[PDB]
Design a protein around this ligand. Sequence first.
Ligand SMILES: [Mg+2]
Lengths: 558, 405
Amino acid sequence: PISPIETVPVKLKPGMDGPKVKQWPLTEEKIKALVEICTEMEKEGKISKIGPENPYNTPVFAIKKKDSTKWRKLVDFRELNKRTQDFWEVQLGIPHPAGLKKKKSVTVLDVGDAYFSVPLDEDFRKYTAFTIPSINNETPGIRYQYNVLPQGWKGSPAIFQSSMTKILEPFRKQNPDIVIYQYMDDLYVGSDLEIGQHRTKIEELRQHLLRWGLTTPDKKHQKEPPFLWMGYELHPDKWTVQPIVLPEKDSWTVNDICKLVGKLNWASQIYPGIKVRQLSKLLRGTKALTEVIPLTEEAELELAENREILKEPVHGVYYDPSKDLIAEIQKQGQGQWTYQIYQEPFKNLKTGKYARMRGAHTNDVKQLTEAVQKITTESIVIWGKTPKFKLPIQKETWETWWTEYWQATWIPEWEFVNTPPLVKLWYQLEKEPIVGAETFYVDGAANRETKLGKAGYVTNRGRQKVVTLTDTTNQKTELQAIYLALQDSGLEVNIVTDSQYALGIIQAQPDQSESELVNQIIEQLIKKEKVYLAWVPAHKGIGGNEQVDKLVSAGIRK
Amino acid sequence: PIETVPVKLKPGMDGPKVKQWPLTEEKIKALVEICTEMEKEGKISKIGPENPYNTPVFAIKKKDSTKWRKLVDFRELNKRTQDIPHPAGLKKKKSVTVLDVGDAYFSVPLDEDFRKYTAFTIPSINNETPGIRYQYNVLPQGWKGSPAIFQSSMTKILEPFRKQNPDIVIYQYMDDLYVGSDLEIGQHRTKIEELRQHLLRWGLMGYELHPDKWTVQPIVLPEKDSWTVNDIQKLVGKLNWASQIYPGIKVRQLSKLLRGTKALTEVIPLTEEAELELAENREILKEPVHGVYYDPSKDLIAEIQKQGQGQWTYQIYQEPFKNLKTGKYARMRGAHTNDVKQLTEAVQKITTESIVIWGKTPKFKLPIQKETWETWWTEYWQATWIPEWEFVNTPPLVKLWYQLE
DNA sequence: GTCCCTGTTCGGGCGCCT
DNA sequence: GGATGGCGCCCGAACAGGGACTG
Ligand SMILES: [Mg+2]
């Protein structure tokens, strides 16, 4: 039937009018499937025949369902959507089985003909006009309009999900201890009741929905485990993801990699150790989906070790609120991280990965803090609380970092775990000038017009050197000078630069960088035993910042 | 009951469309319990997705109480809302108490054509349920127009208490009422309880301020008996920057001591003219900043520098190098120090001073990653207002300028 | 003013679930 | 083949903000 619920008032954008698009030709098979759908919907009152008083029209087309047998009537409302008002989507996320609590009895049933049972605003039904042909010369084409929610409209998902919440509100208020996970028309129902008393409560839900025009066909009424819910399999005490089959081409293109990485990201929620850095690196700078790209040696190696992880059995458990939430992070190279959330040892609730490369320059401690935040925000969505962490970083290594780091950074309750590779700082800048170390006064200068520059230094022991550069900037010359001082100094050196840009990068202690010049600076800083970096204002006559400034400015400035 | 007052937006500005951020379980349970009681009393109503506007919402649990306070981040709506002398004596009272009179805004209805802009969405744990949206029917708490529309009725209530106590300054900002006096500790609290009873006769907190103790942290210079090249180089760079604020600062004689290419650990004896130059600079930093006038039509900018060891320095200004106040904020120096928890306490004390001194919230430049702040800042918030902020990566130079020895 | 460098946000593609 | 919405990932693109530079 049709729900007796009040419609949602919808308007077009100001100054706009309904669409006027002609129907494209359709396959004979699709025409025969669209007429049986429309002839039955016209009887049920879900669509109404219109005449010449309706100047609007919108194409339609039909695709197969996941059931693969019946047909789904879709409408290409791309024009009406551009002219329809803006909505606020009520679906704030996707439910995850790790957030489910252990229930005594579980039922998963869906609503039949979900959209087509919710009415559409009467003043808006004229814009949803469509036309369907038939056997030519034997009967012309019929023109209907939607009296319910069409599949292809912008506002249909938000209106259905909102109306579904209003319908389930009296049942939830009356049965506050019956948990109903509501995703579109799928209904996961859990209770702490005996199976006989639970099935009684299910019929009360089916009679309540039937009162609001929503039927629950027995074909989609699951009564025994495993329950097929949101793409998982719910057993009484554990869950698992439906089988994931990776593609296996030999001439991988952009579109092929885009779906391989997409499936691996979906797999990393329960399969620990998934890494997609090298595969995602190939997709850089591409232009077309059909653009073929050969895999690299590290990409072949990364894809191989991923395929081995999926050929292993793994499952998740359900959340117990009386116990703690524990997250354990493991480090992979090239800024990759994986984590495992559990309450009992080796009984994971779920897993995951973090590899978002943030900032041009960073280190492992920054990336670990970023992973702690992404996990904390993700845990608040699924369980509503913050987990306790098990991080592969020493207490002293963290105390040292947030002591010298000028920004406020904090990690919640955690403890150190000895699971290499550990997170460490590969070098430490000195806080005071080094006694017995040669003092380098470095400076760089570049010309904006010709892109020519010079980087060099003068030392308090009489040494000086100047290197010419081509196609450089003023910031790069300042960095090139610091790299030159490290190259020609001993294991302990004092450097004085006038570039707060270069000083700010080095004080943050990066171990990886997009810039190869900065990486070369990082490698030098690791080999040094002591480094002290001071700053003086440029063009103020301070020595020996003046002697080096006059040396690099010669021939490129003034 | 009472006739509504029409309120519209600014020209060419749509309503707010900010997405709700994840809330913890104990905060959602509190908001659901509060919204149901607000809906029973007609203060809010359910709305659908045809309302394209949304404003985030959360809750705070005050110190020692099992009561939650609903908080709506309405500062994005206040920027779009269509646009009394500030008491200069409030910053001079011995003690000032802050009262939360936000409940009084529920007695006045809201303009019907404006209610659609005050929408918010209550999320569900693990997305068990789509977002349940509401909208306000009366004057919302934390909105710019709520104290303005209620300004007429507010003066009627406080008038007899203002007359009976002329030596008491009562200033209102957002859902807060600032009450200061020169009474002794005890008679002040007795007088605060008198106002609480007088405010409960109509319909229907923390902690305790002392604006007399609000001091400034001036730029101080190091004092040594043995100076090296590094010590003088760091001093010259600090005075060179400080001369942007204090034009009297000179650095001629200190710079000539560094002629040549010297080692950083070489000890340099101060000449008489250089030692005198350092003495004159210390007196200049003691003088107040000249020619700084408070412009109400511009934002108050507040920078914060993490100095470590629980020390936090801040400066309030509107124009570059035109500081209105430079102070510090120190807390516990333990090993379990929470940087985020200390930073939110700093921005609350700084905002509280701005509301007292100038009656406006400052715009913060916060030295913290954006993701780090939004994840934990609501767990330590305790005020009914929310100042606007941006996130920055400060140079470690400003850290050393406002340093402390 | 311009050039440079780095930050965040946005929408494109893919993955998953009427 | 030809629709919509949610969330996730990754990428490049279009901004905004601050610092340094020419004469
Ligand atoms: Mg320089």
